[PDB]
Swiss-Prot record, chain A:
One of its GO terms (molecular function) is DNA binding domain binding. Induction: (Microbial infection) Expression increases when incubated with M.tuberculosis or its lipoprotein LpqH; induction is TLR2-dependent (at protein level). It comes from Homo sapiens. Residues 4-257 form the NR LBD domain. The chain holds residues 235 to 502 of 505 of the full protein. One of its GO terms (cellular component) is nucleus. Keywords: Activator, Biological rhythms, Cytoplasm, Diabetes mellitus, Disease variant, DNA-binding, Glycoprotein, Isopeptide bond, Metal-binding, Nucleus, Obesity, Phosphoprotein, Receptor, Transcription, Transcription regulation, Ubl conjugation, Zinc, Zinc-finger. This is Peroxisome proliferator-activated receptor gamma. Residues 1-46 are annotated as: Interaction with FAM120B. It is linked to Defects in PPARG can lead to type 2 insulin-resistant diabetes and hyptertension. PPARG mutations may be associated with colon cancer. Obesity: A condition characterized by an increase of body weight beyond the limitation of skeletal and physical requirements, as the result of excessive accumulation of body fat.
Length: 257, 250
């Protein structure tokens, strides 16, 4: 019945606002550059980077790498917080809860990071700054293509023009995957996701009526997601061996078996 | 006026049923009157108890954590129930969070009393009953965690409140306008001065010869907040004992 599926889309959109302070709605306000309320300092080269550290709160390529690292730790927390509010999730076997978070987090991060990107760069520092795609594309040996495949996915994914109320149901679907390695009761995860997909389906049809087969389009973006996850993971084990003086966070480490 | 407060009351009761599966009427039945739950009185019964019971997970650590998982489910039950309170969803979303952040513990200890008698607590959604003694008997850090919760339950249950009393009572807790960092207390206390009006009528209709039960219930709000502070400082102590799992129980 639609009334329950609509109700679920409201509940989900409500914690999503409550759990992620940097929404696509606020990111596109900033990114459109029409609003003078608070336009971002642009970091486009090494020099404006050093100028950036004066009026913006946050070698070079390393401290930026460790930057994403800290914001990833922080996103895992927000995603974790959002997960709890998905009906039925905290009722699952704790081992399955932990397993849905081990795998769903990366895919939600890049999904949410898309909100903060356009073809030319990414809002950094809670939107205070804008860091350029080509400046990120030009950092030292291995760092220069940490972020470029996230740009590619975002350009492709942002083409769907989802707003936050669609992303809310969709990132819930990502969390509730019954096909994650090592799950103990796949079936109750599948029952929740069944319902989330139902909610997402009516939501996509209502929020984007003329945009036909958006659901099918979106579901198929989760191929690009698992791909981007895997490039990042192996591209991370080079840096483990490139720089043994640089340290992965315990929390993110446990999300990388 | 009277019959709106009664409409408000039965709204809350009806909604509290949906949101809280094990109710005090349900609980009280198991504790004294078939469908009796497995009892954990010592170490021996516990190891057999996990074997036969349906639970998601050192012993004192395991019981402590089991209390954290239930806690997190309660937060979801209370959160789902809070959204049914007239006017709640329309408050500033920042204030909804603040009310829930602080009100959540006081609701948990209120509803935990429903599952407690002087001898122990109904556990495992009522499928078990863990004796109060066996929780006393836990290690110095863990053995005084749930004793004050029992102490409160004994006093609170002496009020002999039912689920329809508790429906309105727990709403009142959530719409407390003295929680730190509220941006717009006016509506919060407009809803509370409404919930209290209906709790007044409800108690007087349903406990007509229990004079000043309303006053007595509101003073028990004092004891709720002192238990929250007791429990908080107790976690201070045990934070001196020991990652994704930790991120869930923050
Ligand atoms: C899952 O939800 C979120 C997704 C992204 C963000 C976010 O602010 N990020 C930004 C702007 C970034 C981009 C960025 C670039 C340089 C420094 C950064 O750190 C600080 C200065 C910041 O800008 O937040 C951040 C980001 C990167 C991340 O790691 C990655 F996904 F790439 F593996 C994770 C989150 C990131 C926050 C929550
Ligand atoms: C709507 O509010 C509540 C919802 C559930 C419960 C509940 O079942 N609890 C029980 C039986 C308990 C007692 C208990 C003891 C040992 C193990 C427990 O975990 C399992 C058995 C369970 O989830 O019931 C639970 C409990 C404890 C809690 O944390 C505390 F408040 F004490 F800090 C919170 C909820 C608890 C109590 C109030
Ligand atoms: C973020 C911004 C820039 C770079 N870089 O120039 O290499 C890298 C990252 C990034 O994704 N860092 C990271 C490391 C470990 C775990 C999560 C994120
Ligand atoms: C529940 C049962 C037993 C113990 N113990 O013996 O230490 C503790 C608890 C408990 O309430 N744990 C808890 C921790 C943090 C937040 C809520 C509940």
């Amino acid at each position: 019945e639609s009334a329950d599926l609509r109700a679920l889309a409201k509940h989900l959109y409500d914690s999503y606002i409550k759990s992620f302070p940097l929404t696509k709605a606020k990111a596109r306000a900033i990114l459109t550059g029409k609003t003078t309320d608070k336009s971002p300092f642009v970091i486009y080269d090494m020099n404006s980077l050093m100028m950036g550290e004066d009026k913006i709160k946050f070698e070079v390529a390393i401290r930026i790498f460790q930057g994403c690292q800290f914001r990833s730790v922080e996103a895992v927390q927000e995603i974790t917080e959002y997960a709890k509010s998905i009906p039925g999730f905290v009722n699952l076997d704790l081992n399955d809860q932990v397993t849905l978070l081990k795998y769903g987090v990366h895919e939600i991060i890049y999904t949410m990071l898309a909100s903060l990107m356009n073809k030319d760069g990414v809002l950094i520092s809670e939107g205070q700054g804008f860091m350029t795609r080509e400046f990120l594309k030009s950092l030292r040996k291995p760092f220069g293509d940490f972020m470029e495949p996230k740009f590619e996915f975002a350009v492709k994914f942002n083409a769907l023009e989802l707003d936050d109320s669609d992303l809310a149901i969709f990132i819930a679907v990502i969390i509730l995957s019954g096909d994650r390695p090592g799950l103990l009761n796949v079936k109750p995860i599948e029952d929740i996701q069944d319902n989330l997909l139902q909610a997402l389906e009516l939501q996509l049809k209502l929020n984007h009526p003329e945009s036909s087969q958006l659901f099918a389009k979106l579901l198929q973006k989760m191929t690009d997601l698992r791909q981007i996850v895997t490039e990042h993971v192996q591209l991370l084990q080079v840096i483990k061996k490139t720089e043994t003086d640089m340290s992965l966070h315990p929390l993110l480490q446990e999300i990388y078996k």
